Design an enzyme around this catalytic site. Sequence first.
Site, PDB file in Angstrom:
ATOM      1  N   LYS A 192      -2.598  71.586  23.589  1.00 27.48           N
ATOM      2  CA  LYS A 192      -3.924  72.052  23.196  1.00 27.48           C
ATOM      3  C   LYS A 192      -3.965  73.575  23.272  1.00 27.48           C
ATOM      4  O   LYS A 192      -3.706  74.157  24.333  1.00 27.48           O
ATOM      5  CB  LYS A 192      -5.005  71.441  24.086  1.00 27.48           C
ATOM      6  CG  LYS A 192      -5.101  69.932  23.996  1.00 27.48           C
ATOM      7  CD  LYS A 192      -5.924  69.377  25.145  1.00 27.48           C
ATOM      8  CE  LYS A 192      -7.390  69.753  25.022  1.00 27.48           C
ATOM      9  NZ  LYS A 192      -8.191  69.272  26.187  1.00 27.48           N
ATOM     10  N   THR A 252     -13.375  68.233  18.421  1.00 26.10           N
ATOM     11  CA  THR A 252     -14.583  68.794  19.028  1.00 26.10           C
ATOM     12  C   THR A 252     -15.677  69.101  18.010  1.00 26.10           C
ATOM     13  O   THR A 252     -15.481  69.896  17.086  1.00 26.10           O
ATOM     14  CB  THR A 252     -14.267  70.060  19.839  1.00 26.10           C
ATOM     15  OG1 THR A 252     -13.847  71.114  18.966  1.00 26.10           O
ATOM     16  CG2 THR A 252     -13.175  69.787  20.867  1.00 26.10           C
ATOM     17  N   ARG A 307      -8.916  58.003  22.788  1.00 23.16           N
ATOM     18  CA  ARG A 307      -8.670  59.138  23.664  1.00 23.16           C
ATOM     19  C   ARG A 307      -9.512  58.989  24.923  1.00 23.16           C
ATOM     20  O   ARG A 307     -10.711  58.703  24.847  1.00 23.16           O
ATOM     21  CB  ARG A 307      -8.982  60.454  22.939  1.00 23.16           C
ATOM     22  CG  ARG A 307      -8.834  61.722  23.776  1.00 23.16           C
ATOM     23  CD  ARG A 307     -10.176  62.225  24.282  1.00 23.16           C
ATOM     24  NE  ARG A 307     -10.061  63.522  24.945  1.00 23.16           N
ATOM     25  CZ  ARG A 307     -10.760  64.600  24.604  1.00 23.16           C
ATOM     26  NH1 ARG A 307     -11.637  64.537  23.611  1.00 23.16           N
ATOM     27  NH2 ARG A 307     -10.595  65.738  25.265  1.00 23.16           N
ATOM     28  N   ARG A 309     -13.983  77.503  37.992  1.00 22.08           N
ATOM     29  CA  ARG A 309     -15.333  76.999  38.188  1.00 22.08           C
ATOM     30  C   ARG A 309     -16.109  77.927  39.113  1.00 22.08           C
ATOM     31  O   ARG A 309     -15.534  78.681  39.898  1.00 22.08           O
ATOM     32  CB  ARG A 309     -15.316  75.575  38.777  1.00 22.08           C
ATOM     33  CG  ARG A 309     -14.935  74.466  37.792  1.00 22.08           C
ATOM     34  CD  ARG A 309     -16.020  74.290  36.736  1.00 22.08           C
ATOM     35  NE  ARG A 309     -15.696  73.353  35.664  1.00 22.08           N
ATOM     36  CZ  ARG A 309     -16.307  72.185  35.479  1.00 22.08           C
ATOM     37  NH1 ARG A 309     -17.287  71.812  36.289  1.00 22.08           N
ATOM     38  NH2 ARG A 309     -15.953  71.396  34.467  1.00 22.08           N
TER      39      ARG A 309
END
Lengths: 503, 512, 509, 505
Positions: A244, A302, A51, A98
């Site tokens: 996802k 994760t 990945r 952000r």
Amino acid sequence: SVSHLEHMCSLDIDSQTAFVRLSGIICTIGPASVAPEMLEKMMATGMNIARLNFSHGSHEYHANTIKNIREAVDNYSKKQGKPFPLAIALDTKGPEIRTGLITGEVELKKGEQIQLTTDKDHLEKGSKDKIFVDYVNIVKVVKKGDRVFVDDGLISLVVDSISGDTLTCTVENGGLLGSRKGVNLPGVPVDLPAVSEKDKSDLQFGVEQGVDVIFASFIRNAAALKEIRTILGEKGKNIKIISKIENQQGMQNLDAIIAASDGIMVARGDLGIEIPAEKVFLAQKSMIARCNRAGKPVICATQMLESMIKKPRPTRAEISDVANAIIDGADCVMLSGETAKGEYPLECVLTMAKTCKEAEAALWHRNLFNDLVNTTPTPLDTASSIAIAASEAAAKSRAAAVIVITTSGRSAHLISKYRPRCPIIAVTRFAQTARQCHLYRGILPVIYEQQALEDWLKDVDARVQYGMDFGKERGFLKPGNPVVVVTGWKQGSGFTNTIRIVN
Amino acid sequence: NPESVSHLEHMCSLDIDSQTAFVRLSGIICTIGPASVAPEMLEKMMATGMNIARLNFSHGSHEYHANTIKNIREAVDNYSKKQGKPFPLAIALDTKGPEIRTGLIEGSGTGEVELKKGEQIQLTTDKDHLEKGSKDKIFVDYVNIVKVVKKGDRVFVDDGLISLVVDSISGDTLTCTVENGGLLGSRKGVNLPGVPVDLPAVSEKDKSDLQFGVEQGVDVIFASFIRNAAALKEIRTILGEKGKNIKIISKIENQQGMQNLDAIIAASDGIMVARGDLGIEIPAEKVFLAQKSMIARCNRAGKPVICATQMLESMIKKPRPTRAEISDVANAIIDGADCVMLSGETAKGEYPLECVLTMAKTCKEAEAALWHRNLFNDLVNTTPTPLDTASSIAIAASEAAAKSRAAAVIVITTSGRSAHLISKYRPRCPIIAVTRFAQTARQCHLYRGILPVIYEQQALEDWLKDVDARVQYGMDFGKERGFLKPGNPVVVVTGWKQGSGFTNTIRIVNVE
Amino acid sequence: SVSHLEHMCSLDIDSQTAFVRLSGIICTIGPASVAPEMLEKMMATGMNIARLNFSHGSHEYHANTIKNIREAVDNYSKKQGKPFPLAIALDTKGPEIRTGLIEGSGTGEVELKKGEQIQLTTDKDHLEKGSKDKIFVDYVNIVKVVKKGDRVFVDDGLISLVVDSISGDTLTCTVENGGLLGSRKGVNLPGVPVDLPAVSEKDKSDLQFGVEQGVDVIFASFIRNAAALKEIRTILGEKGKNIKIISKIENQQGMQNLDAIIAASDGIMVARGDLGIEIPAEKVFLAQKSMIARCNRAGKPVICATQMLESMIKKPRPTRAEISDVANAIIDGADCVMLSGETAKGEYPLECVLTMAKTCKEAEAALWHRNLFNDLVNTTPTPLDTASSIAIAASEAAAKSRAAAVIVITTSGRSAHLISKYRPRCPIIAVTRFAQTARQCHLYRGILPVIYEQQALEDWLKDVDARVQYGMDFGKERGFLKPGNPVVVVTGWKQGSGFTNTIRIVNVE
Amino acid sequence: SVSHLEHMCSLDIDSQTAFVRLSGIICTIGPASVAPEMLEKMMATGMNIARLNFSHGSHEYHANTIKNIREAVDNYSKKQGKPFPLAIALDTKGPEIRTGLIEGSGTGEVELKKGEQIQLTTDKDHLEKGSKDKIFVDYVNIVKVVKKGDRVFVDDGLISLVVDSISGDTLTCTVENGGLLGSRKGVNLPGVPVDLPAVSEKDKSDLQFGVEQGVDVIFASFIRNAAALKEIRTILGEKGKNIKIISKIENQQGMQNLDAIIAASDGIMVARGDLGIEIPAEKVFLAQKSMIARCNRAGKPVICATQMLESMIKKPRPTRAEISDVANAIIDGADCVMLSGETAKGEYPLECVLTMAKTCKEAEAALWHRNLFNDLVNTTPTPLDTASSIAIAASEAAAKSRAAAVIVITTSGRSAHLISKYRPRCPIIAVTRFAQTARQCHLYRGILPVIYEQQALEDWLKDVDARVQYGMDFGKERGFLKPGNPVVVVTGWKFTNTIRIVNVE
């Protein structure tokens, strides 16, 4: 066993498992693993698909990484002839929000008020009093309540008031605030486009590179996947997209996504910030389950083996997490910082493969198979009937493996859906299908490049006997063991409608 | 359209939006150390949800642990400002056990020497290895290593970091080759997997520690390296008349304890799966199997089981845990574990309060996730024979609470056993156990769902008036804490005669 | 047992059955059984409720039958000293259709053969001259209900007709299936939704007669569109308000809206006699296995009836098929079983009741208690009222402890009914002050009613304990339990009428 | 359809069943059915196998019946190119005990009263003048086998006596229940395990006669142990080795060690007639529901028999209890159902077969296929032979795809038997060259046998495809399927090991 409690009681550490490991291992590539020799060692350890994290790095970096992984996989692929397929993963940067600039080092104290603004003239002027945010129409969403996170959930705010471009907020416990930090708006439905400009360029780059799979971040609605397929276009049509699920909106209409998707990844990192962390396991155990019903791959990802980044041995909690992930029904497992940044990548992949073998053996095949049989099928298509009957035959005869001949890969996908214990040796001429087959549990792809015979009848038998030779070489089976063979009629599309038991 | 026909359909039906109940049934065990030893921090942990404190006797002197006990008693009495209701808290003693250890490395140079594969190391009678230890010589305290070890067997040093294989066997010495080599440190444990060690379960230091715990009035002991039931016979004989009431929890740490688990669980009051030593003993990849077996068998027997070691490790250094640790604790409770435990997290860790809080939250969620109907049916079906008259009352009370969706079940008990039988069947509602005896209420925390309430008021002459007064006191406790409100149904279990093991009666009662 | 197949394999003839027989036996009273001495003998054999068929006989006839039943229960009452309750049931004639009279010439029954034509005229002036050319109906103008393709049956399904042409007053038909037509024979219309009144005039008078006599139960025939039960309750009025009505499902309409009927009814009888004529006979078992099942879901009594032991009318011993029929009826979940001509007209009524009790005991023992209990538990939805929770918990406790019996203290009888729904193996000794509730308790499987005559005690707690001890005494005298056995006792919390919420396990002394 | 209760609740009379009827129907042949026209009409109505009761009739009578049945099966073949297969079954007289002659004259039947005394003697010189005082029986070794309080029956279980005392040759008895004693009446000793030989001299001659006649199946009465079937196999010899034996469980000894019998036998019939006399009648259903169940576990045919539709002998319509009995017999899992006096002595044979077929269809549709299949899956051992794995996979595929039929190619017939064990809803069209295997396939639920006359083709695949296509044509002729329907075809190499799903051409 009669009941689930009696099944759990019957677990024996002395009872040895089979050598085969069905579940795929995903490794994120980074500075520790980018080297070709280290990549070959990881590949020998058991990495099925690598990945690449596009949230950082340029096109040149990832292109060089692909070149290095190709030279390494070809150097390892020097057994048998031209086999050993390996899948390519993309994973988009995705629509993120952000913070601005203050370098930073500002401190935010609990109880005080700060203001997150979309006005551009504060992008550089950020401080503890006022802060810029990337998201433009954050004011369109968000209510008079709704908590806000900054930097991986480290800092939390509560929206007090909403003006034109101000959003005065109070600090629900604060720490050191930096610049260009995370977002995560828990609860709110984000309107950002599923595919941004960087995602567009990255998907076109992936099409040019010939990637096998894309992991699409922040998949909220079903129009997202139409956009992704149309942007991949005619050339990339064969490439499979894995969605996802990172926020509440994607979780809310999960069934529509799974129907539209080729597979789903439970990205526990961003999800744990979005929804309360204590609920995350619920989500995965839901998500995986629904995926097993639909027949689409699901990946647990994760922070599975985080501690192994610094230390050579994992913790008990991490082994338990990976074992419970595979026992839930997860097709693949993933390593993030363990392989990319970590100091001990080989140990991570090795311990992952071993614990996957153990938890894989621990499964309760009869009850799980019975549940998957009645969960959705109706009169059934007829294609799935062949797969389910072959799985039942392999389970009853205690077959060493099942050999599947497929062009698209679908028949092996259905058989993996029904969860047999024995490996599924899928023989295919097409390299890309064999590589992307690793996304499904139990599929060992075998690529057959050797020419075809004029008659299809003897050619399919030659391919099945080649699968037999592969099984003996790897050690799956020995003389006298039974196996299941599934073929079809005519050299065309999905026509796998023959089942045979052969010793 | 029900609550799931199959297990897969159950997992599909889990909804994050569906809110859980306020009550948290499973107990939280916290190890006490320098970070948590202070009385004020101990009160904060107790308010956060710490149900039982664990003392690790493998380190520290008797005076240190006596000071810790003094601080915990003062803290638990100081907490008793909830309406004026003295809050019970259990104290647990974890034994050092029969362990084998190496000596210290020289302070010369870096802290730890390095041992590489293929090199030589002499197992000798080196007595001055407490300061001159190095890479050359190693001494062990196990006298009978010869009869026990075989040729192909492997030996580990330092938490699994270094592995050796015994090559040859002499009178006093084993000759080994380095299979896996690392950084040899000082005072490190030696555990050999496959092989069963003959060492006594209770050593001399363990004897002194158990007598000290009996004198101090400890509630529970966690006994390490429990191999056979004769261990527990010896422990009962050493605890004697004074400690007879103290409950012994066996720790399954090696392959020998795992092999004969049923005899241990039958002889024990409860079991802890100490994954620390277990992960070294059996292959680490298998550890989950053990716990998922062990816990399960405990749930069948009706004895408490504890999932322990390395649950929230990451929180020692950082304020928030990882996804893997939350998954581990959630799967531990979903397996059926009565209690969960923290080792370095609360004792040595920097963020004890955050550890206890996040443990309670994830415990509540995984507690809500359970499939009560199928699990209840299985627990009903495990005992095929005619059931004990007390256990029949317990199972019927659990069934009534499940069917009526009772807010709680009120249990009035002297010995505490009836509440334990009810806890075995895993009801969703809390089990309000009313008892005059402090220690029984304290040790009740080992069982899932038992909220102990201590009744200080003296014995009234009329037994019916007294039992009704205690049930009304349980009602008041439930209303004050917030378990239930007016209009909710609850189950009340009493008895038929004034005494001990004579439980009986099941009643559905509303709230006023 | 783990599975149903493995359970059936596990049946053992060596395995001894329990002494108790839970399922009730219903007997129709007639010339063979009407005598008081024979009636007492039937009661001693095990008859739980007597059934009176009002389709024949006068009001005076049924009153005399009730008098005989009462004198029989009176002399039986000196067996063990306590008043033995027995329920009396009124079965209405209902809205039925019959043919007219044949000309007395020739043979009694003319023969109708397939392929011939016959004219139904409805015209009442063709009552004596009926033959093969002309036919006559009983009541109601069915031509507004019947279409051409529809089929018609006459005489217990023996003769079948198909309507060829329809006119105003008349009806021309062709014989599809032909038999032997007599005079005044029953006519069943399988396809059509029947327009007949739910309660006719004679049915009204009969229900009022039953109210005056103090009958325990009514079996209402031809319950079709469920609205009827309101009429039946309103006609029973203040005096009959306590009497329970059992609906009989005899035609396609009652089967079609079965859920509304079962919700409105106190119980259901599957009258396979008329049903087998209405719907195809081969289908009848389906219906019963549905009907009984739904009743078991609702908690309502269900009765399997008609032609269970027919051969025993003529011969002293039944066939294998009849024993299998009764055993499968009780295994289906039927609360009570019934005998029609076996006891009324048959020559061997006592043997019928004996073999019925024996086969009921055996098929009762064969049951798979755990799976059935789990099924009935999962049928019940929400946080049920405290009474149903107590009943289900008490049933679970009795099953787990292998209790010898369950003693129920009840005024209305409902608590014992809720316990009966869940099918415990042990008897349900229901102690009641009210005679009529104990009498009608026999409609539920497993309830042994006990009537308590003393009572009127000053202390209510002492009174409830005395009644429970009287239930213990009944159990010991009958032989249900002995010292050392555990039993479940369900009482209440306050002197009321529908409260319960107490469960205790107590051993016998 | 989550639970069994919910399954029973969901049963709908309006819900139509499939046309196929899987369970076989057995008819006893007698004076009413011996005629060729009646036999052809019964065959067309749905008679699957004819049963001959050797307890009555001479060899000439049964030979005439066999000749008529063969003429009937050949004469029926008026289906355009369809050679009709039919199975023939022989039911043995078996080891029974009988009395001598009474002195019945004047009035039809004499009356014997309760409470009188009777002396059961083994002395042969008491035979002609029997009436009520002393009674002789042909069982020699009664004394070694009978205990004190054991019971004795007379006349089909209707009359009961209790043995009071025991002497050397004789027994003195007391009348518990009294009736009329006739001539040549059956005597069954319930409690005792009888030691009589399973095959007597008459049984030997009858079995050899059946082998000469070419019978398909034998029903062996009073099967107690496995040595019985050892004797039966040795008497069938090389010629009859292929003939399948069905054991009749009529007494307690066969019930006690039933598993050994069921394992050693080819199949079992629950003869409720004699069994109800042996064990208490109230218990008989238990036995059958056990027996049938175990047979379904073993994979061997089981037959529920005797007194199923008795009332139809006298009346044109059956009772509700009889329809319920046959429906519950098939729902229990019985492979075949049988009629005794209904077809042999009864007035309405055709009507019996008609109502039997209809009720069989209905109870067949009522079944809970998934749970029964799951139970049959978990009953079978862990490693399993490849043939049974093929069968179970084919059944699962047919259930999931809702196939119109399953086509099975077999020479011996076993593979189709394994498929029938797992109880698929769709018909099992079994194609075979050998007539007798097709005939004996009727003992199994769901097998429609098809006989293929075309000769062995040189190429193997073409021959197997031709046989499967003839099965397709048979399905179209009967009306089972139409184009677009899926079916299962199971073939193999050489030993079956190929399973495929093919739709209709």
